Amino acid sequence: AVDTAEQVYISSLALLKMLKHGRAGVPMEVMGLMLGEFVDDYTVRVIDVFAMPQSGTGVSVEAVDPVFQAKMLDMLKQTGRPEMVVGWYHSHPGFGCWLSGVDINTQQSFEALSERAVAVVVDPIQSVKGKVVIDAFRLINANMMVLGHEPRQTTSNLGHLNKPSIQALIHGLNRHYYSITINYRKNELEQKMLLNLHKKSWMEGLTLQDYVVKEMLELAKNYNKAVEEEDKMTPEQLAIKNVGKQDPKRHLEEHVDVLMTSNIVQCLAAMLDTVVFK
Amino acid sequence: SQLDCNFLKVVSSSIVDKYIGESARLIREMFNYARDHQPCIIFMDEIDAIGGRRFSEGTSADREIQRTLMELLNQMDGFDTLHRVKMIMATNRPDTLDPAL
Amino acid sequence: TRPANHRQLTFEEIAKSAKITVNEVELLVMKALSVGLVKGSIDEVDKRVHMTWVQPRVLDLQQIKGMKDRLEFWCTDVKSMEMLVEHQAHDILT
Amino acid sequence: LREELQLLQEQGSYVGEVVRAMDKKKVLVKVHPEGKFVVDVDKNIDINDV
Amino acid sequence: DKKFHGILDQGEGVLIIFDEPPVDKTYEAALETIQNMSKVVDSLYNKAKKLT
Amino acid sequence: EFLHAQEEVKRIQSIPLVIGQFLEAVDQNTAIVGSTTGSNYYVRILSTIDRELLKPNASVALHKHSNALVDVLPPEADSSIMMLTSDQKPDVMYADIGGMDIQKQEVREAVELPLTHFELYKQIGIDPPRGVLMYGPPGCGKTMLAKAVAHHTTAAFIRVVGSEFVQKYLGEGPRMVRDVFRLAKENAPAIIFIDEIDAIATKRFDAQT
Amino acid sequence: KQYEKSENDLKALQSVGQIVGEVLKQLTEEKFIVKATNGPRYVVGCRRQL
Amino acid sequence: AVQKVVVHPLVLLSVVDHFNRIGKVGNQKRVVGVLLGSWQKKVLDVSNSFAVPFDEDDKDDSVWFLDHDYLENMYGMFKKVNARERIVGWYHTGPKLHKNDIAINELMKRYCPNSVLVIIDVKPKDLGLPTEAYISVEEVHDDGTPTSKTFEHVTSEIGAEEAEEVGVEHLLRDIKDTTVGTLSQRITNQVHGLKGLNSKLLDIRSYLEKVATGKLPINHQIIYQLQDVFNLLPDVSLQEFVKAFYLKTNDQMVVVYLASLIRSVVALHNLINNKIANRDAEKKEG
Numbered sequence A: 001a002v003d004t005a006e007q008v009y010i011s012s013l014a015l016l017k018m019l020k021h022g023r024a025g026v027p028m029e030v031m032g033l034m035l036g037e038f039v040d041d042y043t044v045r046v047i048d049v050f051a052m053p054q055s056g057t058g059v060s061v062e063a064v065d066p067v068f069q070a071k072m073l074d075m076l077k078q079t080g081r082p083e084m085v086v087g088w089y090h091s092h093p094g095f096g097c098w099l100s101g102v103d104i105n106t107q108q109s110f111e112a113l114s115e116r117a118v119a120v121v122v123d124p125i126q127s128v129k130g131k132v133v134i135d136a137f138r139l140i141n142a143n144m145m146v147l148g149h150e151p152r153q154t155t156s157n158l159g160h161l162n163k164p165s166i167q168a169l170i171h172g173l174n175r176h177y178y179s180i181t182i183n184y185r186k187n188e189l190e191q192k193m194l195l196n197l198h199k200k201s202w203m204e205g206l207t208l209q210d211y212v213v214k215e216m217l218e219l220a221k222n223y224n225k226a227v228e229e230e231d232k233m234t235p236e237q238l239a240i241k242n243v244g245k246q247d248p249k250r251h252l253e254e255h256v257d258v259l260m261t262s263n264i265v266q267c268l269a270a271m272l273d274t275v276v277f278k
Numbered sequence B: 001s002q003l004d005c006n007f008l009k010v011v012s013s014s015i016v017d018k019y020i021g022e023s024a025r026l027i028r029e030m031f032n033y034a035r036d037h038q039p040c041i042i043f044m045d046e047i048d049a050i051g052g053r054r055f056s057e058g059t060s061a062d063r064e065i066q067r068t069l070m071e072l073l074n075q076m077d078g079f080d081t082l083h084r085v086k087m088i089m090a091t092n093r094p095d096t097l098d099p100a101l
Numbered sequence C: 001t002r003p004a005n006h007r008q009l010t011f012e013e014i015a016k017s018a019k020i021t022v023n024e025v026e027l028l029v030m031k032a033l034s035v036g037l038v039k040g041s042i043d044e045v046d047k048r049v050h051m052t053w054v055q056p057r058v059l060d061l062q063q064i065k066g067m068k069d070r071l072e073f074w075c076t077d078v079k080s081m082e083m084l085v086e087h088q089a090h091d092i093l094t
Numbered sequence D: 001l002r003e004e005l006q007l008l009q010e011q012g013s014y015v016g017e018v019v020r021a022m023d024k025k026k027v028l029v030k031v032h033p034e035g036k037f038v039v040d041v042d043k044n045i046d047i048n049d050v
Numbered sequence E: 001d002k003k004f005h006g007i008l009d010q011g012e013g014v015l016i017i018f019d020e021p022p023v024d025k026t027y028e029a030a031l032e033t034i035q036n037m038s039k040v041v042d043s044l045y046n047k048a049k050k051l052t
Numbered sequence F: 001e002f003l004h005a006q007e008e009v010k011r012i013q014s015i016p017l018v019i020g021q022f023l024e025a026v027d028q029n030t031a032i033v034g035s036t037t038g039s040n041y042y043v044r045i046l047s048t049i050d051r052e053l054l055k056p057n058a059s060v061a062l063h064k065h066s067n068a069l070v071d072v073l074p075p076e077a078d079s080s081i082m083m084l085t086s087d088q089k090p091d092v093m094y095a096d097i098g099g100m101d102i103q104k105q106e107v108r109e110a111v112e113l114p115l116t117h118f119e120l121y122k123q124i125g126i127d128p129p130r131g132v133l134m135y136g137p138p139g140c141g142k143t144m145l146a147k148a149v150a151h152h153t154t155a156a157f158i159r160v161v162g163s164e165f166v167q168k169y170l171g172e173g174p175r176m177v178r179d180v181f182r183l184a185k186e187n188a189p190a191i192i193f194i195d196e197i198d199a200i201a202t203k204r205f206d207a208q209t
Numbered sequence G: 001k002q003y004e005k006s007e008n009d010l011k012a013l014q015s016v017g018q019i020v021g022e023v024l025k026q027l028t029e030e031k032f033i034v035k036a037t038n039g040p041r042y043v044v045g046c047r048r049q050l
Numbered sequence H: 001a002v003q004k005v006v007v008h009p010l011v012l013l014s015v016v017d018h019f020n021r022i023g024k025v026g027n028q029k030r031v032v033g034v035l036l037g038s039w040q041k042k043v044l045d046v047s048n049s050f051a052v053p054f055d056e057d058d059k060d061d062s063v064w065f066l067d068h069d070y071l072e073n074m075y076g077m078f079k080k081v082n083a084r085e086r087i088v089g090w091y092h093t094g095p096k097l098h099k100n101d102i103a104i105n106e107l108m109k110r111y112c113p114n115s116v117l118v119i120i121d122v123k124p125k126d127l128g129l130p131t132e133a134y135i136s137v138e139e140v141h142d143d144g145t146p147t148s149k150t151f152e153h154v155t156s157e158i159g160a161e162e163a164e165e166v167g168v169e170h171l172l173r174d175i176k177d178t179t180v181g182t183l184s185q186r187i188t189n190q191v192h193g194l195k196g197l198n199s200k201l202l203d204i205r206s207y208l209e210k211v212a213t214g215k216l217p218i219n220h221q222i223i224y225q226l227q228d229v230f231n232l233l234p235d236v237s238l239q240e241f242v243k244a245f246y247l248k249t250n251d252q253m254v255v256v257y258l259a260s261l262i263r264s265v266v267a268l269h270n271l272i273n274n275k276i277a278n279r280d281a282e283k284k285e286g
């Protein structure tokens, strides 16, 4: 047997060291190890994606230097906590980030090392705020070909993981592979202060600065009117026989809103004389 | 061994290798580099391998010989003339040359 | 020392404080532009000089206190009228 | 509709060239530059329009 | 007859030449609105026709 | 959330613009574009593109992974030196040509006069020639007439090396002719002089080389 | 000092070669039309201080 | 040196997680860990850093310890895996400095001749940007004391990187994109008028600190001087800006023209399709 719906908690410094690590080595696939804490069966957390030394000849299982395991992990023991590894990371920048033959070559070594040994797959050139590029797996064994595959006792959480059916090549690799749920969980010690960094360090930065303006007069008036004549052409062609005439398009775009933000923000900039000055 | 400035001595037989507009691109590079280093001295030995006169569309590679030759026929003249580009020519029998040249 | 700048400062002020004649305030202010302490325009259509930024002198304690007077005056007027403008713009937030 | 624009963010396709179809519901396609490929049909298409 | 914006001033001396030529803001806007009223006239027959 | 969807539209074209040309339109939200990678693609258009921009051909922008159509570009993709743009004339006076009333008056009727009085051609229906060919004994100022009319034109003037198009990349030539003719229709009642067209115009080929 | 020569040569190991391109033309202030020698055409931007 | 800094929030979270490493154990004073950094120009950058164990007893503020062996071994790891990176200084989480920090700084300026500290706050609510830069140099003194070695507030900012907010703006989920035209201007009004002039009132509170106190360095060097940079505008009563209201009318002129013409054309926008679609939906309802 019986198997509970699993879950991958993050600390998001995982994702930051994946974007920074795979951003640093961006023309090349990288290989690494993932640290965290084995909390229970149905959840497991990542709390540390840490740097792993480069291979030049082959990205493989030989990228794990055991003296860097003793020295790196031991100097993490004399860092604030000796926590337990939860798996391993890598990258695939060159394509749509599916499980290379190296990953199946070292997966049995990694699950000889660990219980879960969950993959971490990424293409570092995807997005700037949007995509969730990281990909996570579990190679279930071929010895369980007698029993039914991926039991997942309730399959309600898995049925709600089953929303995208993502990556049809990995779905070509549905033989003994399946994705897992990854939430982007909260860090109340970190989320609100990240909102302070983010929001208060971006809303005018110092929140005192701009409270440019006389050249957006001319730029804005040309940008407006040069679109306004082609906006006003079509009432030549507005007529009756509704289905017999076909050209429906709005002509009000960026002339309400851009002009409201334009003249209102720059007329409050005209109010910065009285607002700033007395 | 007298001026010793910029003697670009083209042997003009090892230009073509197999390709299409490769020798043309070499002509563009020689004329642009020649435009750059203002006191260039062009030399070309044995024009008759690449020069010719004309055919009646025989061997198909002689087409590329003709367009490669018309690289010279235009780009020696063009609309933008050359400055200080002294083209020194050598031959064995100058009867077989193109009257375009 | 004087209130604000008066925007236009006379040959009697420069010449009387300077204990000099009228026809040396010109060389005084141009020579001051050679020094570079001021960037003032030589307003002598009326012999009454316009002011710009200057290098200051030593802040006395009464300069601290009167500076706190007009400075706090500026502070709570821009802050108070600031809160008034925000109070007029208070109903349009949602 | 605007949330349904990841459909427009889906992977594009290839323009091919059908010489003729062969037996057992497969066709032959040469693409823009490449060789010939005996490739597979879908369900919502017509073998009668090969 | 000819011009260089040399406007007459009997008591200045410079005979001040000055202008502000780019004021195409109101130029292009007025030229649009003149056509716009013709477009509203082009809508008037649709409006008065569709009702009654 | 509509604004969030707006930025999700806007994010499609930031770092790359992978250039192709618009080839075919089936219908709404479906097209065929010949990329500048040499290969052709069944694609789909986005609702951002105004459908009149499709025309027959356009310098269009694509996507990296999905390779979806992103944008239709303005008229671009140079005519080599680009109509020469300023002053790059051979600087030959019109009376510099000595004693060719047949040639100067003839080509004056052929090109220089439809530059000016084309509407008066249109009322009669003379149908003036699109282009013209010059030939004969070489050395007689065949370049020089293009120098003088080039020096004394008002519209665009594009010199074209006839040996220009035979280059290394496989398929650049006809797109370069699209550059010349899209720019030709794009500028004005313009003038394009093409010299040494025998480099392209060969009557005999070999369809194996 | 041999470990210093292999130190500098050791530091240059992580560098990656770049691409030879050529500017076709400038599209806008941020958009740039180039064509690399190996093939197709692109529009990109400068870095910061180019 | 130093022009300013470029500091990504990633290394700030590299302070936060070690604050989680010490928040579970007995926190004596605060965190002091390494600040690695990417120093290229007179500007600065930081992509990464790491921490190091540290205690301090407050009796002579001189008994305090890092592990330089740990620092150079893990620095050998990080230098090995990234040749770009080197040390640039340190950091501390308690937002107020103290006297030992010059011994921390000058004790680690032996590796690189600058060692910039970073003030942060694990619970910030009042500050603007958390990041802060000093440099430990001398202006001797006017009296010329024996080496008044002084931290100098080099200006500081949050750095940025392409594709670093892939986590962040997906995580926070709360962002309202482009609030220009609605209430962002008055957020900045409340926080700059209030949160600017309250800082002005703490500077005038420091002026009262010079009144009743403040003879330490009464600071008649920079205060009235850059306060004379402020006193470019002596805005006394009667207000003396007769040469600014035709200026104000010139400023109001073009904008009110754009409101007149352009907003009349905004009426011309709404009216046409509003009437046509209005009576389409009205008398074509039945």
Ligand SMILES: Nc1ncnc2c1ncn2[C@@H]1O[C@H](COP(=O)(O)OP(=O)(O)OP(=O)(O)O)[C@@H](O)[C@H]1O
Pocket (backbone or CB within 6 Å): B077, F096, F097, F098, F099, F100, F137, F138, F139, F140, F141, F142, F143, F144, F145
């Ligand atoms: N009628 C003329 N009056 C004055 N100069 C003339 C005249 N005809 C020819 N020339 C001179 O001779 C030159 C003729 O050569 P041009 O380059 O114009 O033709 P071309 O390039 O020789 O053509 P092709 O390469 O086919 O022989 C002119 O540039 C000019 O210097």
Ligand SMILES: [Zn+2]
Pocket (backbone or CB within 6 Å): A029, A090, A091, A092, A099, A100, A101, A102, A103
């Ligand atoms: Zn791999």
